[PDB]
Design an enzyme around this catalytic site. Structure first.
Site, PDB file in Angstrom:
ATOM      1  N   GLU H  66       0.836  -1.192   0.000  1.00 13.33           N
ATOM      2  CA  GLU H  66       0.000   0.000   0.000  1.00 13.33           C
ATOM      3  C   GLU H  66       0.876   1.249   0.000  1.00 13.33           C
ATOM      4  O   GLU H  66       1.994   1.251   0.521  1.00 13.33           O
ATOM      5  CB  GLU H  66      -0.928  -0.007   1.220  1.00 13.33           C
ATOM      6  CG  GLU H  66      -1.935   1.141   1.293  1.00 13.33           C
ATOM      7  CD  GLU H  66      -2.901   1.165   0.124  1.00 13.33           C
ATOM      8  OE1 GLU H  66      -3.160   0.092  -0.461  1.00 13.33           O
ATOM      9  OE2 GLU H  66      -3.406   2.258  -0.210  1.00 13.33           O
ATOM     10  N   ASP H  94      -1.756  -5.231   0.988  1.00 17.60           N
ATOM     11  CA  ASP H  94      -1.131  -4.083   1.636  1.00 17.60           C
ATOM     12  C   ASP H  94       0.295  -4.358   2.093  1.00 17.60           C
ATOM     13  O   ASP H  94       1.163  -3.491   1.953  1.00 17.60           O
ATOM     14  CB  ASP H  94      -1.970  -3.638   2.838  1.00 17.60           C
ATOM     15  CG  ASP H  94      -3.424  -3.418   2.481  1.00 17.60           C
ATOM     16  OD1 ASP H  94      -3.693  -2.643   1.540  1.00 17.60           O
ATOM     17  OD2 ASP H  94      -4.299  -4.024   3.134  1.00 17.60           O
ATOM     18  N   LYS H 120     -14.328  -9.238   2.760  1.00 17.67           N
ATOM     19  CA  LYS H 120     -12.990  -9.268   2.175  1.00 17.67           C
ATOM     20  C   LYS H 120     -12.528 -10.695   1.911  1.00 17.67           C
ATOM     21  O   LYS H 120     -11.857 -10.956   0.905  1.00 17.67           O
ATOM     22  CB  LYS H 120     -11.998  -8.538   3.081  1.00 17.67           C
ATOM     23  CG  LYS H 120     -10.636  -8.307   2.441  1.00 17.67           C
ATOM     24  CD  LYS H 120     -10.608  -7.024   1.611  1.00 17.67           C
ATOM     25  CE  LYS H 120     -10.152  -5.824   2.432  1.00 17.67           C
ATOM     26  NZ  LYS H 120     -10.959  -4.605   2.163  1.00 17.67           N
TER      27      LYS H 120
END
Ligand SMILES: C[C@H](C[C@@H](C[C@H](C[C@@H](C[C@@H](CCN1CCCC1=O)N1CCCC1=O)N1CCCC1=O)N1CCCC1=O)N1CCCC1=O)N1CCCC1=O
Ligand SMILES: C[C@H](C[C@@H](C[C@H](C[C@@H](C[C@@H](CCN1CCCC1=O)N1CCCC1=O)N1CCCC1=O)N1CCCC1=O)N1CCCC1=O)N1CCCC1=O
Ligand SMILES: C[C@H](C[C@@H](C[C@H](C[C@@H](C[C@@H](CCN1CCCC1=O)N1CCCC1=O)N1CCCC1=O)N1CCCC1=O)N1CCCC1=O)N1CCCC1=O
Ligand SMILES: C[C@H](C[C@@H](C[C@H](C[C@@H](C[C@@H](CCN1CCCC1=O)N1CCCC1=O)N1CCCC1=O)N1CCCC1=O)N1CCCC1=O)N1CCCC1=O
Ligand SMILES: C[C@H](C[C@@H](C[C@H](C[C@@H](C[C@@H](CCN1CCCC1=O)N1CCCC1=O)N1CCCC1=O)N1CCCC1=O)N1CCCC1=O)N1CCCC1=O
Ligand SMILES: C[C@H](C[C@@H](C[C@H](C[C@@H](C[C@@H](CCN1CCCC1=O)N1CCCC1=O)N1CCCC1=O)N1CCCC1=O)N1CCCC1=O)N1CCCC1=O
Ligand SMILES: C[C@H](C[C@@H](C[C@H](C[C@@H](C[C@@H](CCN1CCCC1=O)N1CCCC1=O)N1CCCC1=O)N1CCCC1=O)N1CCCC1=O)N1CCCC1=O
Ligand SMILES: C[C@H](C[C@@H](C[C@H](C[C@@H](C[C@@H](CCN1CCCC1=O)N1CCCC1=O)N1CCCC1=O)N1CCCC1=O)N1CCCC1=O)N1CCCC1=O
Ligand SMILES: COc1cc(CCNC(=O)c2[nH]c(-c3c(F)cccc3F)nc(=O)c2O)ccn1
Ligand SMILES: COc1cc(CCNC(=O)c2[nH]c(-c3c(F)cccc3F)nc(=O)c2O)ccn1
Ligand SMILES: COc1cc(CCNC(=O)c2[nH]c(-c3c(F)cccc3F)nc(=O)c2O)ccn1
Ligand SMILES: COc1cc(CCNC(=O)c2[nH]c(-c3c(F)cccc3F)nc(=O)c2O)ccn1
Ligand SMILES: COc1cc(CCNC(=O)c2[nH]c(-c3c(F)cccc3F)nc(=O)c2O)ccn1
Ligand SMILES: COc1cc(CCNC(=O)c2[nH]c(-c3c(F)cccc3F)nc(=O)c2O)ccn1
Ligand SMILES: COc1cc(CCNC(=O)c2[nH]c(-c3c(F)cccc3F)nc(=O)c2O)ccn1
Ligand SMILES: [Mn+2]
Ligand SMILES: [Mn+2]
Ligand SMILES: [Mn+2]
Ligand SMILES: [Mn+2]
Ligand SMILES: [Mn+2]
Ligand SMILES: [Mn+2]
Ligand SMILES: [Mn+2]
Ligand SMILES: [Mn+2]
Lengths: 181, 181, 181, 181, 181, 181, 181, 181
Positions: H66, H94, H120
């Protein structure tokens, strides 16, 4: 305390050093920047103008009196007086002009520069102290029409003032700011 | 050693680089800043004045001789002499004026600028070296009334001098400082 | 390699950025700063003079050609030529004067400025390129007696040159330095 | 995305802050610096010229409009207009001249300064906004032959422009850059 | 004064902060770094070793006593004593070990670590103070064979010591340095 | 000289300090980073790997030999040898392990780690010097299967290596880079 | 206002950031650092101890509550409470221990740690909040004899405390400081 | 554009580097931080959590995915995959855990961690990618109850999250923020 969006704007709008200096000034006078936020924005605006003002002209031309704590600013005022011979003003001014040999009182107003200058000129009995007013609309008013600085320098101050006004109106805090002075 | 509150004032009053430079100067002459503290404050004051002095005028106008160690300052003095043709002074001066082609001896006094200038002018046989005196009361005395610098620059030095005086008196160390020179 | 005390002096005497730039210049020409140390001190001295030279005058007055690598300096020379119309010099100069519209070749010598200027003027067929010579004794020689810079600026360069000479003699490396050019 | 060697050149050629500012400008207009790389180099070149331009002249002389985001630049334009009285331009300019009281539109072209100035002058109906064109060949064209800046300042811009051209040709990307505008 | 090439080596060899600290130490003891240059190199070497020593181990493990001025170091020694209960040493040590609860006297020698440790152990009557010796040849000698630090940390100190020796011999100043202690 | 887009990639890809160190290394060996650009990228890659390698492990664990100039690295190697007792290697290694008491030769290859390790192990007669190979594909090969570092540290090096490979292929310079070693 | 030599000592003794934080704390409570100078030194001492305390242990181990303004510290306290489940204390503590899951109240006293701990333990009804007392003589007193930190970390705090005491006594301000709490 | 007081809060609340990174992320996805301000605050919060997350654990433990631009993050993901052997995820994660050899998807939610994790986990078909959810109320939910980090590190993230919630509610923007996801 807390809750005012004028506070987040003031912090995002002004230089962080100016914000710390405004907080000390109000806290020295028993005012809370998180509560009286219109004065918090006003003290920041007045501080920045004084700084861009001393930035105009030569390098050693001015002595910054605003932004110092009350005792230190009065100490510097005495030193200027007891060495130049100028008379000690009744109220703390913002600058001293080594080039023109006079203290400068700098005013920023949300109304006519005519009224504010009348108010400030009625406060200082020492007509020797120079007065220079700016407004958020772009006007300025100075003693004896002596504007002290170059046209370009004062133009920068008026532009910055109008940008602060636009950013307040865009956040819908301008109307409360103008009807607060 | 230790115990003098002049020392804590000198450290809080002056720029830390100036304080380190004053300590080296006295230690080069076998003096202890923690013991002879009135001279410690005097060496700091003299150092700062010399620095604000060279700060006045143009960028390459002066050559700072004070603040260098004894050997380096004498090395620079020779280079100035052996390239400009000016005569080597008997005693180390503080500045050299590339604009006026003369060394400057800068004096700061706690009495009349008349007496100190008499004393310093009687020390240098080279009447070519310019003398410029400042006092803690706001007076100044220079050779041939040639004050070298602008009015505004010398005004800054006199103001700073009077602030140091006020801060000493506020701490009740001024009376010992004046009656020490 | 290693062993020369000229190397430790050069490192303690000159700005570290100038020392890195001198090392690149010699290494670009197949010379070892640890072996040919008199040229190492010479390249540092020439570099510093060029830098104090461009430091004299206005802010955008000069374009520094010395200190760039060979390809970049020639690239900048072309850009100056193909936009000002001046003729491309046969040899890389040190500066370009936007105020006087000419390239400057800066020379530092350990002999008479008369001989070195003769030598350098005989090298450049372009009599348009300005020549300005300095010596370690305090003399200077320029084209058409046009010294380009203020008296005070050139005085600083001559003083710095004489200090480098004194520091070399104090370390007993000056005699080898003068009888090396 | 990825693959263009114009991108690596632009990053190695220009100041990193200018590169970040060019990326924001194109991304604000839906353009990819990794894809439309000739415009990426053009936006960087235009940005740098505007910055060296405001660097010419006095300290508070110009107000930089280019490089701000669209909303902030328009906010500053209003403040300049509503305090100087000048008319609000139809298109965002690059600078405002506090000394001459006019906005400046700065153009960098890969063709004749005659054609580009014709194009840009035909875009702004406000003939009050000053136009100043530069080319990669060394020419310049300004309104009323008023070039606003000193000869030396504009000479620096033309030289930098020609260096960027040489570095592109050396990397064989110049021909694509010129035949892209 | 001036002339010693040990001085230029010491300045190019050691960290500039360590050099300033060594100058203060000798000047506190009436010694000139430009005259007694072998002791100048020795005081720098001893200072660096003490610093890499405290750098070994945990973050708050040691308290640096060396490098402080005489009064401050003695002030810190008292605070360590009057809070840990350890006995006040007769001579100022270099470190205090919060992990082992003892002061450390760090020695660097140009002879056998056997002789120097004998000398230093005969000086401190407080057998409680730990002694740790290093040599320029790579040996070390500590009290009760307690070397306080990891093998890797002491290996770094011995390597740095041998590099300083090589650099001195390369400059032909090692023989004078060894036959000086 | 000039023209290679490997050069702009190397400058945009690697840390600027690593790029300056690679330029010095090649210039010390009579190689031009602007001409032999595949070796320029290789020397940068090898330099970075050595730096991330010493970054793995404890703080004083390694001594960086790569990146020093030839004389300084050999000086440090001697100091390590003459204090640890390890044998002086015939060729300059990259690191020394204070924890394992051995020099490390770090290799980065564009082929099988099997071939490169064979080549490098055949060069050093001192089988005491540890060898650790990395490849751009993700493999590694070390002496006695002793990989010196944690799994996570070596994983970082392999990832960085594969990113450099992808960025080269994206710029279509990878094929020339692999078929160049 | 002005005149106290405790003020110059506090400024020369403590870190300038700690001094600014102590000034804000007292000004938030309507106290003048130039008038109530013994509390000014006390607030600085308490602040530093809290900072060296959080410096002991792991990196994310503590959350600093002291030094924040009243609203922000209470905001952080709530976040700690509403995520760890610990009970909201009646009075603002100084630290929170993520490792031990408790708030820490840190006390510095000029008398017996026995009396101060009694006083502070009688103030917080939440016996869950840990208490850790330090004295200027070298003693410490903690809840359940759980001293939270390593022996070496607390030793550093006690030493620093005794140095501040010595420096006050050397300036003859200690007796007023002890007989002020 | 302009007008949202969520924008001034986001700028005053978050680190300026995180704010610049959030602006690039949204602008890469065709979103305006001045218009969609609730997502602007969300992207900042998610960014900070990812950064404090990688800050937990060892120095080389994580690889931050990220905050990189889309192409660079995918380049790093490939390098991690093609060297560790892990499978290329369908969506950009991430972090990557060099210690646990898995990519981490970090989620911050304004509802139950149960629902968001369900959402998710239903998106990534690669059950190999670790999922770690945080909420503004103080809860967390991770794959296989493997929370990857120390208790103290995750406690810091939950506290910071609750402070951001309090500051939003104090400015009356929390209710719009929660009912926006
Ligand atoms: C001296 C120092 C603070 C000065 C205040 C003033 C601020 C100045 C800073 C300049 C640089 N610019 C310009 C670009 C941004 C910036 O930053 N400007 C002017 C514009 C806004 C701003 O910020 N100036 C002027 C001299 C250097 C300096 O900083 N003040 C405060 C009151 C008294 C005084 O002289 N001091 C003194 C001790 C405490 C402290 O803070
Ligand atoms: C050159 C350097 C030190 C200089 C001394 C002098 C100090 C100067 C610093 C300026 C910036 N300002 C102004 C604002 C605050 C500040 O800091 N002023 C003037 C006012 C007080 C002050 O501090 N100047 C002038 C050039 C740059 C510099 O720093 N000196 C010392 C003696 C010789 C010399 O040239 N050197 C040289 C090597 C060792 C060292 O320290
Ligand atoms: C631009 C930059 C380097 C410049 C060289 C030159 C050095 C200058 C530095 C100034 C500040 N002062 C003055 C006080 C001490 C100091 O430091 N002076 C002059 C005196 C000694 C010195 O050092 N200048 C001038 C502009 C800013 C700068 O640094 N050069 C090198 C050749 C081309 C060039 O323009 N560049 C460009 C890219 C690589 C690099 O390094
Ligand atoms: C104000 C600031 C950025 C300014 C842009 C401009 C850049 C300037 C920097 C100077 C110093 N030099 C000169 C040497 C290298 C360097 O760096 N130059 C000019 C040459 C290249 C360059 O870079 N200037 C001028 C004032 C200070 C400054 O930086 N801009 C951007 C648009 C509006 C504006 O005023 N701001 C404002 C907020 C965001 C930001 O970034
Ligand atoms: C605290 C400070 C100075 C310290 C001396 C010591 C120096 C230390 C610096 C570190 C960082 N590294 C390591 C890499 C290069 C560098 O620079 N090392 C160790 C190796 C060489 C070196 O330089 N340390 C340790 C704490 C931080 C610091 O700087 N000293 C001096 C005596 C007392 C003391 O604690 N102080 C205190 C006030 C005056 C001053 O200067
Ligand atoms: C010591 C110094 C340079 C060191 C080289 C090495 C570089 C190191 C820098 C670190 C910080 N990180 C990590 C994040 C980015 C960064 O910057 N890393 C490692 C990763 C990339 C990088 O850059 N290290 C290690 C100690 C401190 C330092 O900088 N070298 C060069 C060879 C010998 C040596 O010890 N020296 C010594 C004098 C000249 C010089 O430059
Ligand atoms: C976070 C920051 C300030 C921190 C206070 C604290 C100060 C810390 C500084 C460290 C570095 N060291 C150690 C050597 C000298 C130095 O300087 N120490 C500890 C010893 C003395 C000192 O000074 N810490 C810890 C984290 C980094 C930092 O600075 N504080 C203040 C209260 C809340 C908080 O977390 N903040 C936050 C926003 C305003 C501000 O200032
Ligand atoms: C590497 C760099 C940025 C890093 C992002 C991350 C930020 C980190 C900064 C640290 C220091 N702390 C902690 C105290 C305040 C601060 O500032 N934290 C963590 C807490 C908040 C914060 O800010 N880290 C980690 C390594 C160093 C660094 O800065 N990123 C961005 C995505 C990829 C990456 O690695 N990069 C790389 C090139 C562009 C750029 O910016
Ligand atoms: C509420 O009173 C205060 C006063 C100070 C310091 C005053 N000293 C000045 O010098 C000052 N103040 C103001 C001013 C303002 F900026 C906002 C509102 C009202 C004002 F009068 N305008 C000036 O022009 C000026 O010079 C700090 C805090 N609160
Ligand atoms: C006790 O003697 C010393 C001398 C030096 C360096 C002297 N060199 C000067 O140049 C110098 N000194 C003084 C001066 C002073 F600042 C205070 C007291 C007495 C003085 F003479 N006034 C100047 O004006 C001046 O130029 C350092 C320490 N102690
Ligand atoms: C594709 O359109 C855009 C526009 C902007 C901002 C435009 N605002 C200007 O002010 C601007 N633009 C350009 C310009 C250029 F530098 C390159 C190509 C085409 C141009 F028109 N030349 C100027 O002189 C100028 O003042 C950003 C990205 N893409
Ligand atoms: C000529 O005397 C001095 C003493 C000091 C401070 C002494 N204080 C120590 O602590 C000290 N000194 C020395 C040391 C040395 F480094 C070089 C030569 C002789 C020595 F004794 N070795 C140590 O190990 C040590 O701990 C400063 C200047 N000159
Ligand atoms: C053309 O020769 C050189 C050598 C140096 C310094 C060599 N010293 C090493 O230590 C070294 N060099 C290399 C290496 C490389 F990185 C690229 C190509 C060939 C190589 F051998 N790989 C290593 O692993 C290594 O340790 C600098 C410039 N050019
Ligand atoms: C006069 O009252 C105040 C209070 C504050 C903040 C109090 N908040 C604390 O947390 C706090 N204060 C004190 C403390 C002290 F440091 C000096 C004197 C008396 C004290 F109680 N000791 C602690 O240990 C502590 O935790 C600031 C200014 N003035
Ligand atoms: C509107 O879509 C986007 C996407 C991006 C980058 C997405 N890449 C991620 O990796 C990502 N995004 C989000 C997320 C959020 F932070 C706020 C709202 C919705 C989200 F899905 N939560 C995560 O946990 C995460 O890993 C940037 C701008 N806008
Ligand atoms: Mn005012
Ligand atoms: Mn004098
Ligand atoms: Mn030349
Ligand atoms: Mn334009
Ligand atoms: Mn010792
Ligand atoms: Mn290798
Ligand atoms: Mn407390
Ligand atoms: Mn996520």
């Amino acid at each position: 305390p807390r809750g005012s969006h004028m506070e987040d704007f003031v912090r995002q709008c002004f230089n962080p050093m100016i914000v710390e200096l405004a907080e000390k000034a109000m806290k020295e006078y028993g005012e809370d920047p998180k509560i009286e936020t219109n004065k918090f924005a006003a003290t920041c605006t007045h501080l920045e103008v004084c700084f861009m003002y001393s930035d105009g002209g030569s390098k050693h031309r001015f002595e910054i009196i605003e932004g110092r704590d009350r005792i230190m600013a009065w100490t510097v005022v005495n030193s200027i007086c007891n060495t130049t011979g100028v008379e000690k003003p009744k109220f703390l001014p913002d600058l001293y002009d080594y080039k023109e040999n006079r203290f400068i009182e700098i005013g920023v107003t949300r109304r006519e520069v005519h009224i504010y200058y009348l108010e400030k000129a009625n406060k200082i009995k020492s007509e020797k102290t120079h007065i220079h007013i700016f407004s958020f609309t772009g006007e300025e008013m100075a003693t004896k029409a002596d504007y002290t600085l170059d046209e370009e320098s004062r133009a920068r101050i008026k532009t910055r003032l109008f940008t602060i006004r636009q950013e307040m109106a865009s956040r819908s805090l301008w109307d409360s700011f103008r009807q607060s002075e």
